[PDB]
Scaffold this active site. Sequence first.
Site, mmCIF file in Angstrom:
data_model
loop_
_atom_site.group_PDB
_atom_site.id
_atom_site.type_symbol
_atom_site.label_atom_id
_atom_site.label_comp_id
_atom_site.label_asym_id
_atom_site.label_seq_id
_atom_site.Cartn_x
_atom_site.Cartn_y
_atom_site.Cartn_z
ATOM 1 N N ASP A 145 39.538 44.716 32.315
ATOM 2 C CA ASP A 145 38.394 44.722 33.229
ATOM 3 C C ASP A 145 38.105 46.113 33.805
ATOM 4 O OD1 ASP A 145 36.423 43.912 34.984
ATOM 5 O OD2 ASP A 145 37.807 43.127 36.497
ATOM 6 N N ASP A 164 30.857 47.697 32.679
ATOM 7 C CA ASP A 164 31.853 46.683 33.015
ATOM 8 C C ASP A 164 32.223 45.676 31.922
ATOM 9 O OD1 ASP A 164 33.492 44.966 34.332
ATOM 10 O OD2 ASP A 164 31.899 44.024 35.525
HETATM 11 N N1 LIG Z 1 34.158 43.410 36.496
HETATM 12 C C1 LIG Z 1 34.421 42.552 37.584
HETATM 13 N N2 LIG Z 1 35.751 42.193 38.019
HETATM 14 C C2 LIG Z 1 36.072 41.360 39.038
HETATM 15 C C3 LIG Z 1 37.429 41.113 39.252
HETATM 16 C C4 LIG Z 1 37.813 40.241 40.166
HETATM 17 C C5 LIG Z 1 37.054 39.555 41.009
HETATM 18 O O1 LIG Z 1 37.705 38.648 42.029
HETATM 19 C C6 LIG Z 1 37.401 37.238 41.678
HETATM 20 C C7 LIG Z 1 36.624 36.823 40.570
HETATM 21 C C8 LIG Z 1 36.416 35.482 40.319
HETATM 22 C C9 LIG Z 1 37.118 34.543 41.462
HETATM 23 C C10 LIG Z 1 37.807 34.889 42.458
HETATM 24 C C11 LIG Z 1 38.034 36.231 42.684
HETATM 25 C C12 LIG Z 1 35.617 39.770 40.817
HETATM 26 C C13 LIG Z 1 35.101 40.750 39.781
HETATM 27 C C14 LIG Z 1 33.706 41.037 39.523
HETATM 28 N N3 LIG Z 1 33.449 41.976 38.318
HETATM 29 C C15 LIG Z 1 32.078 41.851 37.736
HETATM 30 C C16 LIG Z 1 31.707 40.364 37.683
HETATM 31 N N4 LIG Z 1 32.740 39.653 37.004
HETATM 32 C C17 LIG Z 1 33.636 38.713 37.423
HETATM 33 O O2 LIG Z 1 33.703 38.251 38.612
HETATM 34 C C18 LIG Z 1 34.651 38.202 36.237
HETATM 35 C C19 LIG Z 1 35.782 39.123 36.126
HETATM 36 C C20 LIG Z 1 37.108 38.594 35.406
HETATM 37 C C21 LIG Z 1 37.584 37.174 35.869
HETATM 38 C C22 LIG Z 1 36.437 36.190 35.933
HETATM 39 C C23 LIG Z 1 35.327 36.858 36.831
HETATM 40 C C24 LIG Z 1 31.092 42.470 38.843
HETATM 41 C C25 LIG Z 1 31.409 43.972 39.133
HETATM 42 C C26 LIG Z 1 30.503 44.465 40.182
HETATM 43 C C27 LIG Z 1 29.118 44.027 39.836
HETATM 44 C C28 LIG Z 1 28.888 42.532 39.911
HETATM 45 C C29 LIG Z 1 29.662 41.869 38.764
#
Ligand SMILES: Nc1nc2ccc(Oc3ccccc3)cc2c[n+]1[C@@H](CNC(=O)C1CCCCC1)C1CCCCC1
Length: 380
Positions: free
Chosen positions: A34, A221
Amino acid sequence: FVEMVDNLRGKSGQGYYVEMTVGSPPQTLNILVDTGSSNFAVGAAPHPFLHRYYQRQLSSTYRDLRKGVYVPYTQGKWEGELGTDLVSIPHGPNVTVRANIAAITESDKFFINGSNWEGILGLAYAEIARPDDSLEPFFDSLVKQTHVPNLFSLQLCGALASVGGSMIIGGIDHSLYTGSLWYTPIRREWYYEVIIVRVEINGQDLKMDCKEYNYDKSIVDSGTTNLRLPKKVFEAAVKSIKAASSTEKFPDGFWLGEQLVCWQAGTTPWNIFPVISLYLMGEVTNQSFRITILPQQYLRPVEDVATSQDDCYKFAISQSSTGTVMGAVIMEGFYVVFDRARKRIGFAVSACHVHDEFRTAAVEGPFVTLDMEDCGYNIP
Ligand SMILES: Nc1nc2ccc(Oc3ccccc3)cc2c[n+]1[C@@H](CNC(=O)C1CCCCC1)C1CCCCC1
Protein backbone atom coordinates in the site's frame (compact mmCIF):
# COMPACT_ATOMS: atom_id res chain seq x y z
CA PHE A 1 16.40 -8.05 -9.79
CA VAL A 2 15.16 -11.45 -11.03
CA GLU A 3 14.29 -13.27 -7.79
CA MET A 4 11.77 -10.50 -7.02
CA VAL A 5 10.06 -10.60 -10.41
CA ASP A 6 6.55 -12.07 -10.00
CA ASN A 7 6.49 -11.85 -6.16
CA LEU A 8 3.10 -10.11 -6.07
CA ARG A 9 -0.24 -11.96 -5.84
CA GLY A 10 -3.89 -11.21 -5.05
CA LYS A 11 -7.64 -11.19 -5.67
CA SER A 12 -9.16 -8.76 -8.18
CA GLY A 13 -10.08 -5.49 -6.37
CA GLN A 14 -8.78 -6.91 -3.08
CA GLY A 15 -5.19 -5.69 -3.27
CA TYR A 16 -1.77 -6.97 -4.28
CA TYR A 17 0.22 -8.68 -1.57
CA VAL A 18 3.82 -9.79 -0.95
CA GLU A 19 5.05 -12.60 1.28
CA MET A 20 6.92 -11.59 4.41
CA THR A 21 8.21 -13.28 7.55
CA VAL A 22 8.33 -11.79 11.05
CA GLY A 23 9.74 -12.93 14.39
CA SER A 24 12.09 -15.74 15.40
CA PRO A 25 11.59 -18.12 14.39
CA PRO A 26 10.02 -16.64 11.17
CA GLN A 27 6.24 -16.41 11.04
CA THR A 28 4.99 -16.20 7.46
CA LEU A 29 2.19 -13.81 6.50
CA ASN A 30 0.90 -12.32 3.22
CA ILE A 31 1.11 -8.53 3.45
CA LEU A 32 -0.80 -5.98 1.35
CA VAL A 33 1.41 -3.52 -0.55
CA ASP A 34 0.00 0.00 0.00
CA THR A 35 1.68 3.18 -1.28
CA GLY A 36 -1.31 5.05 0.19
CA SER A 37 -0.36 4.53 3.88
CA SER A 38 2.73 4.36 6.17
CA ASN A 39 2.20 1.76 8.94
CA PHE A 40 3.28 -1.90 9.06
CA ALA A 41 0.32 -3.70 10.68
CA VAL A 42 -0.63 -7.37 10.89
CA GLY A 43 -3.38 -9.46 12.39
CA ALA A 44 -2.10 -10.52 15.81
CA ALA A 45 -5.19 -12.35 17.06
CA PRO A 46 -7.71 -14.88 15.64
CA HIS A 47 -10.15 -13.54 13.08
CA PRO A 48 -12.98 -15.06 11.03
CA PHE A 49 -11.38 -13.74 7.82
CA LEU A 50 -7.80 -14.58 8.81
CA HIS A 51 -6.16 -17.90 7.93
CA ARG A 52 -3.29 -16.99 10.20
CA TYR A 53 -1.72 -14.36 12.42
CA TYR A 54 1.29 -12.89 14.23
CA GLN A 55 1.92 -14.75 17.51
CA ARG A 56 4.16 -12.35 19.37
CA GLN A 57 4.73 -14.73 22.29
CA LEU A 58 6.35 -17.25 19.95
CA SER A 59 9.01 -14.75 18.89
CA SER A 60 12.29 -14.31 20.76
CA THR A 61 13.10 -11.14 18.80
CA TYR A 62 9.76 -9.51 19.70
CA ARG A 63 10.01 -6.33 21.78
CA ASP A 64 6.94 -4.51 23.18
CA LEU A 65 6.89 -0.72 22.80
CA ARG A 66 4.10 -0.56 25.39
CA LYS A 67 2.32 2.00 23.23
CA GLY A 68 -1.01 1.75 21.41
CA VAL A 69 -2.33 2.84 18.01
CA TYR A 70 -5.82 3.72 16.74
CA VAL A 71 -6.58 3.94 13.02
CA PRO A 72 -10.16 4.84 12.19
CA TYR A 73 -11.23 5.45 8.60
CA THR A 74 -14.48 6.23 6.69
CA GLN A 75 -16.23 2.90 7.24
CA GLY A 76 -14.40 0.86 9.89
CA LYS A 77 -10.97 0.89 11.51
CA TRP A 78 -8.13 -1.05 13.07
CA GLU A 79 -6.41 -0.80 16.47
CA GLY A 80 -3.41 -2.47 17.98
CA GLU A 81 -0.32 -2.68 20.10
CA LEU A 82 3.06 -1.44 18.95
CA GLY A 83 6.38 -3.23 19.20
CA THR A 84 9.33 -4.18 17.03
CA ASP A 85 10.66 -7.41 15.57
CA LEU A 86 12.83 -8.87 12.82
CA VAL A 87 11.32 -8.84 9.37
CA SER A 88 12.21 -10.40 6.07
CA ILE A 89 10.92 -10.52 2.49
CA PRO A 90 11.63 -14.06 1.17
CA HIS A 91 11.35 -12.97 -2.49
CA GLY A 92 12.97 -9.58 -2.00
CA PRO A 93 16.41 -8.33 -0.97
CA ASN A 94 18.36 -10.76 1.21
CA VAL A 95 18.16 -8.62 4.35
CA THR A 96 16.67 -8.59 7.88
CA VAL A 97 15.41 -5.42 9.51
CA ARG A 98 14.21 -4.48 12.98
CA ALA A 99 11.00 -2.59 12.28
CA ASN A 100 7.91 -1.25 13.94
CA ILE A 101 4.93 -3.59 13.87
CA ALA A 102 1.41 -2.71 14.86
CA ALA A 103 -0.16 -5.89 16.23
CA ILE A 104 -3.79 -5.50 15.14
CA THR A 105 -5.88 -6.60 18.14
CA GLU A 106 -9.20 -5.03 17.13
CA SER A 107 -10.72 -4.31 13.73
CA ASP A 108 -13.96 -3.26 12.05
CA LYS A 109 -14.40 -3.83 8.30
CA PHE A 110 -10.63 -3.89 7.73
CA PHE A 111 -9.81 -7.46 6.72
CA ILE A 112 -11.50 -8.73 3.56
CA ASN A 113 -13.08 -12.20 3.35
CA GLY A 114 -10.91 -14.37 1.05
CA SER A 115 -8.31 -11.69 0.17
CA ASN A 116 -5.42 -13.86 1.36
CA TRP A 117 -3.65 -11.06 3.17
CA GLU A 118 -3.14 -10.91 6.94
CA GLY A 119 -1.57 -7.49 7.13
CA ILE A 120 -0.67 -4.20 5.49
CA LEU A 121 2.63 -2.69 4.40
CA GLY A 122 2.54 1.11 4.13
CA LEU A 123 5.26 2.43 1.84
CA ALA A 124 4.34 6.14 2.06
CA TYR A 125 6.13 8.67 4.29
CA ALA A 126 6.25 9.17 8.06
CA GLU A 127 4.07 12.30 7.99
CA ILE A 128 0.98 10.15 7.57
CA ALA A 129 2.10 7.39 9.95
CA ARG A 130 -0.01 6.55 13.04
CA PRO A 131 0.05 7.50 15.96
CA ASP A 132 2.38 10.22 14.61
CA ASP A 133 5.41 10.76 12.38
CA SER A 134 7.67 9.53 15.16
CA LEU A 135 6.87 5.88 14.26
CA GLU A 136 9.52 5.08 11.63
CA PRO A 137 7.82 3.50 8.56
CA PHE A 138 9.19 0.08 7.59
CA PHE A 139 10.87 1.13 4.32
CA ASP A 140 12.70 3.85 6.26
CA SER A 141 14.13 1.19 8.58
CA LEU A 142 15.10 -0.91 5.58
CA VAL A 143 17.27 1.79 4.04
CA LYS A 144 18.85 2.81 7.37
CA GLN A 145 19.83 -0.67 8.59
CA THR A 146 20.99 -2.08 5.23
CA HIS A 147 22.60 -1.07 1.95
CA VAL A 148 19.32 -1.34 0.08
CA PRO A 149 19.06 1.72 -2.17
CA ASN A 150 16.27 4.19 -1.32
CA LEU A 151 14.02 3.24 -4.23
CA PHE A 152 11.48 0.55 -5.27
CA SER A 153 9.13 -0.06 -8.16
CA LEU A 154 5.78 -1.68 -8.93
CA GLN A 155 4.41 -3.59 -11.92
CA LEU A 156 0.77 -4.47 -11.26
CA CYS A 157 -0.45 -6.80 -13.98
CA GLY A 158 -3.93 -7.85 -12.77
CA ALA A 159 -4.98 -9.46 -16.09
CA LEU A 160 -12.78 -13.87 -8.33
CA ALA A 161 -9.82 -14.03 -10.71
CA SER A 162 -6.39 -13.98 -9.04
CA VAL A 163 -3.96 -11.19 -9.93
CA GLY A 164 -0.16 -10.84 -10.13
CA GLY A 165 2.70 -8.35 -10.36
CA SER A 166 6.13 -7.50 -8.99
CA MET A 167 7.68 -5.21 -6.40
CA ILE A 168 11.36 -4.57 -7.03
CA ILE A 169 13.03 -3.33 -3.91
CA GLY A 170 16.15 -1.21 -4.32
CA GLY A 171 16.15 -1.03 -8.10
CA ILE A 172 14.79 -0.96 -11.64
CA ASP A 173 14.29 -3.84 -14.03
CA HIS A 174 14.29 -2.77 -17.70
CA SER A 175 12.50 -5.96 -18.61
CA LEU A 176 9.30 -4.84 -16.93
CA TYR A 177 8.58 -1.91 -19.21
CA THR A 178 8.89 -0.65 -22.80
CA GLY A 179 9.97 2.76 -24.08
CA SER A 180 11.51 5.41 -21.84
CA LEU A 181 10.89 6.21 -18.14
CA TRP A 182 9.48 9.72 -17.53
CA TYR A 183 9.76 11.25 -14.07
CA THR A 184 7.55 13.73 -12.24
CA PRO A 185 8.55 15.40 -8.94
CA ILE A 186 7.05 14.25 -5.64
CA ARG A 187 5.44 17.50 -4.52
CA ARG A 188 5.77 16.70 -0.81
CA GLU A 189 6.86 13.66 1.13
CA TRP A 190 3.78 12.36 2.96
CA TYR A 191 1.55 10.68 0.39
CA TYR A 192 3.31 10.06 -2.95
CA GLU A 193 2.01 13.37 -4.21
CA VAL A 194 2.22 14.61 -7.80
CA ILE A 195 0.78 17.43 -9.97
CA ILE A 196 -1.50 16.84 -12.97
CA VAL A 197 -1.21 19.75 -15.36
CA ARG A 198 -3.74 18.73 -18.00
CA VAL A 199 -6.29 16.02 -18.79
CA GLU A 200 -7.42 14.78 -22.21
CA ILE A 201 -10.14 12.36 -23.25
CA ASN A 202 -9.90 10.98 -26.78
CA GLY A 203 -7.34 13.68 -27.64
CA GLN A 204 -9.72 16.41 -26.42
CA ASP A 205 -8.42 18.68 -23.69
CA LEU A 206 -10.75 18.51 -20.69
CA LYS A 207 -10.22 22.27 -20.62
CA MET A 208 -10.41 23.41 -17.00
CA ASP A 209 -8.31 25.04 -14.30
CA CYS A 210 -5.47 22.57 -13.73
CA LYS A 211 -5.88 23.23 -10.02
CA GLU A 212 -9.11 21.22 -10.25
CA TYR A 213 -7.15 18.10 -11.21
CA ASN A 214 -5.26 18.26 -7.92
CA TYR A 215 -8.07 19.70 -5.83
CA ASP A 216 -6.84 18.87 -2.35
CA LYS A 217 -4.17 16.52 -3.71
CA SER A 218 -3.12 13.97 -6.31
CA ILE A 219 -1.45 10.76 -5.11
CA VAL A 220 -0.26 7.48 -6.63
CA ASP A 221 -1.85 4.76 -4.54
CA SER A 222 -1.59 0.95 -4.94
CA GLY A 223 -4.00 0.51 -2.02
CA THR A 224 -6.88 1.86 -4.12
CA THR A 225 -8.62 0.02 -6.95
CA ASN A 226 -10.14 2.87 -8.94
CA LEU A 227 -9.00 6.02 -10.70
CA ARG A 228 -10.74 8.59 -8.46
CA LEU A 229 -11.22 12.10 -9.80
CA PRO A 230 -12.44 15.16 -7.92
CA LYS A 231 -16.24 15.60 -8.39
CA LYS A 232 -16.07 18.36 -11.02
CA VAL A 233 -13.34 16.52 -12.97
CA PHE A 234 -15.32 13.29 -12.69
CA GLU A 235 -18.51 14.77 -14.19
CA ALA A 236 -16.50 16.38 -16.98
CA ALA A 237 -14.68 13.12 -17.80
CA VAL A 238 -17.80 10.93 -17.70
CA LYS A 239 -19.47 13.45 -20.04
CA SER A 240 -16.54 13.36 -22.43
CA ILE A 241 -16.46 9.55 -22.21
CA LYS A 242 -20.19 9.23 -23.04
CA ALA A 243 -19.79 11.52 -26.04
CA ALA A 244 -16.96 9.40 -27.49
CA SER A 245 -18.75 6.11 -26.80
CA SER A 246 -22.11 7.59 -27.89
CA THR A 247 -22.47 5.04 -30.71
CA GLU A 248 -23.74 2.82 -27.89
CA LYS A 249 -25.89 3.85 -24.95
CA PHE A 250 -25.37 2.51 -21.41
CA PRO A 251 -27.46 2.84 -18.23
CA ASP A 252 -26.67 5.50 -15.60
CA GLY A 253 -25.77 2.79 -13.10
CA PHE A 254 -22.76 1.95 -15.23
CA TRP A 255 -21.15 5.36 -15.10
CA LEU A 256 -21.83 5.36 -11.34
CA GLY A 257 -20.14 1.97 -10.92
CA GLU A 258 -23.38 0.54 -9.51
CA GLN A 259 -23.87 -2.02 -12.31
CA LEU A 260 -21.76 -3.94 -14.77
CA VAL A 261 -21.88 -4.21 -18.55
CA CYS A 262 -21.69 -7.54 -20.36
CA TRP A 263 -20.93 -8.45 -23.95
CA GLN A 264 -20.87 -11.82 -25.69
CA ALA A 265 -17.52 -13.42 -24.83
CA GLY A 266 -14.49 -11.83 -26.49
CA THR A 267 -16.73 -9.29 -28.20
CA THR A 268 -16.10 -6.17 -26.08
CA PRO A 269 -16.08 -3.09 -28.34
CA TRP A 270 -12.95 -1.46 -26.89
CA ASN A 271 -12.63 0.85 -29.89
CA ILE A 272 -15.82 2.75 -28.92
CA PHE A 273 -14.27 3.72 -25.59
CA PRO A 274 -11.63 6.51 -25.60
CA VAL A 275 -8.08 6.61 -24.24
CA ILE A 276 -7.42 8.91 -21.31
CA SER A 277 -4.32 11.00 -20.72
CA LEU A 278 -2.96 12.55 -17.57
CA TYR A 279 -0.23 15.14 -18.12
CA LEU A 280 2.19 15.23 -15.23
CA MET A 281 4.51 18.07 -14.26
CA GLY A 282 7.99 17.21 -15.56
CA GLU A 283 11.36 17.77 -13.90
CA VAL A 284 12.57 20.42 -16.34
CA THR A 285 10.92 23.88 -16.25
CA ASN A 286 7.89 24.38 -18.50
CA GLN A 287 7.92 20.66 -19.29
CA SER A 288 5.31 17.95 -19.02
CA PHE A 289 4.76 14.44 -20.28
CA ARG A 290 1.66 12.30 -20.45
CA ILE A 291 0.53 8.85 -19.45
CA THR A 292 -2.31 7.26 -21.44
CA ILE A 293 -4.56 4.41 -20.38
CA LEU A 294 -7.14 2.43 -22.35
CA PRO A 295 -10.62 1.03 -21.53
CA GLN A 296 -8.73 -2.19 -20.83
CA GLN A 297 -7.51 -0.23 -17.83
CA TYR A 298 -10.57 1.66 -16.63
CA LEU A 299 -13.10 -1.09 -17.42
CA ARG A 300 -12.35 -3.70 -14.76
CA PRO A 301 -13.54 -7.35 -15.33
CA VAL A 302 -16.18 -8.62 -12.88
CA GLU A 303 -18.26 -11.78 -12.45
CA ASP A 304 -21.80 -11.64 -13.83
CA VAL A 305 -24.96 -12.56 -11.94
CA ALA A 306 -24.93 -16.35 -11.62
CA THR A 307 -23.94 -16.77 -15.28
CA SER A 308 -20.32 -16.85 -16.45
CA GLN A 309 -20.72 -16.79 -20.26
CA ASP A 310 -20.54 -13.08 -21.12
CA ASP A 311 -17.58 -10.78 -20.37
CA CYS A 312 -18.69 -8.43 -17.62
CA TYR A 313 -17.04 -5.13 -16.63
CA LYS A 314 -17.46 -2.37 -14.08
CA PHE A 315 -16.58 1.27 -14.84
CA ALA A 316 -13.51 1.65 -12.61
CA ILE A 317 -13.47 5.48 -12.58
CA SER A 318 -15.24 7.00 -9.58
CA GLN A 319 -15.96 10.34 -7.89
CA SER A 320 -13.69 11.72 -5.19
CA SER A 321 -13.97 14.03 -2.20
CA THR A 322 -10.27 13.47 -1.44
CA GLY A 323 -8.40 14.61 -4.57
CA THR A 324 -7.21 12.63 -7.58
CA VAL A 325 -6.25 9.05 -6.63
CA MET A 326 -4.24 7.14 -9.24
CA GLY A 327 -5.08 3.61 -8.17
CA ALA A 328 -4.68 0.19 -9.67
CA VAL A 329 -6.43 1.34 -12.88
CA ILE A 330 -3.67 3.81 -13.65
CA MET A 331 -0.89 1.63 -12.15
CA GLU A 332 -1.77 -1.48 -14.21
CA GLY A 333 -0.79 0.18 -17.45
CA PHE A 334 2.55 1.30 -16.06
CA TYR A 335 5.80 0.25 -14.41
CA VAL A 336 6.00 2.83 -11.59
CA VAL A 337 9.31 3.78 -9.95
CA PHE A 338 9.06 5.25 -6.48
CA ASP A 339 12.45 7.05 -6.53
CA ARG A 340 12.52 8.30 -2.92
CA ALA A 341 16.24 9.16 -3.19
CA ARG A 342 15.66 11.60 -6.00
CA LYS A 343 12.24 12.65 -4.72
CA ARG A 344 10.42 11.64 -7.91
CA ILE A 345 8.07 9.12 -9.62
CA GLY A 346 8.89 7.35 -12.91
CA PHE A 347 6.37 5.96 -15.42
CA ALA A 348 7.00 3.69 -18.39
CA VAL A 349 4.68 1.60 -20.53
CA SER A 350 4.13 -1.70 -18.70
CA ALA A 351 5.36 -4.83 -20.41
CA CYS A 352 2.33 -6.60 -18.92
CA HIS A 353 -0.46 -4.03 -19.45
CA VAL A 354 -3.59 -5.37 -21.17
CA HIS A 355 -4.29 -3.91 -24.64
CA ASP A 356 -5.30 -4.91 -28.14
CA GLU A 357 -4.08 -4.93 -31.73
CA PHE A 358 -5.06 -1.32 -32.27
CA ARG A 359 -3.96 0.62 -29.20
CA THR A 360 -1.44 0.45 -26.42
CA ALA A 361 -1.01 2.42 -23.19
CA ALA A 362 1.63 5.16 -23.62
CA VAL A 363 4.08 7.49 -21.90
CA GLU A 364 5.17 10.50 -23.96
CA GLY A 365 7.08 13.76 -23.72
CA PRO A 366 8.04 16.28 -23.53
CA PHE A 367 5.38 18.96 -23.88
CA VAL A 368 5.62 22.71 -23.27
CA THR A 369 3.41 23.65 -20.30
CA LEU A 370 3.37 27.00 -18.46
CA ASP A 371 2.72 27.82 -14.78
CA MET A 372 2.45 24.13 -13.88
CA GLU A 373 3.41 25.23 -10.37
CA ASP A 374 0.02 26.92 -10.08
CA CYS A 375 -1.65 23.55 -10.67
CA GLY A 376 -0.83 22.59 -7.10
CA TYR A 377 -3.42 23.26 -4.42
CA ASN A 378 -2.81 24.93 -1.06
CA ILE A 379 -5.00 25.20 2.06
CA PRO A 380 -6.80 28.59 2.50
N1 LIG B 1 -4.07 3.71 0.16
C1 LIG B 1 -4.87 3.74 1.32
N2 LIG B 1 -4.55 3.03 2.54
C2 LIG B 1 -5.28 3.00 3.68
C3 LIG B 1 -4.81 2.21 4.72
C4 LIG B 1 -5.52 2.05 5.82
C5 LIG B 1 -6.67 2.63 6.13
O1 LIG B 1 -7.29 2.36 7.49
C6 LIG B 1 -8.52 1.56 7.30
C7 LIG B 1 -9.03 1.12 6.05
C8 LIG B 1 -10.18 0.35 5.99
C9 LIG B 1 -10.82 0.12 7.48
C10 LIG B 1 -10.39 0.50 8.60
C11 LIG B 1 -9.23 1.24 8.65
C12 LIG B 1 -7.22 3.47 5.07
C13 LIG B 1 -6.47 3.68 3.77
C14 LIG B 1 -6.92 4.50 2.66
N3 LIG B 1 -6.02 4.44 1.40
C15 LIG B 1 -6.73 4.82 0.14
C16 LIG B 1 -8.12 4.19 0.15
N4 LIG B 1 -8.00 2.79 0.40
C17 LIG B 1 -8.38 2.00 1.45
O2 LIG B 1 -8.99 2.43 2.49
C18 LIG B 1 -7.99 0.42 1.26
C19 LIG B 1 -6.61 0.20 1.69
C20 LIG B 1 -6.17 -1.30 2.05
C21 LIG B 1 -7.17 -2.07 2.97
C22 LIG B 1 -8.60 -1.90 2.50
C23 LIG B 1 -8.85 -0.35 2.38
C24 LIG B 1 -7.00 6.39 0.27
C25 LIG B 1 -5.67 7.21 0.40
C26 LIG B 1 -5.98 8.63 0.55
C27 LIG B 1 -7.01 8.99 -0.48
C28 LIG B 1 -8.36 8.35 -0.28
C29 LIG B 1 -8.23 6.85 -0.55
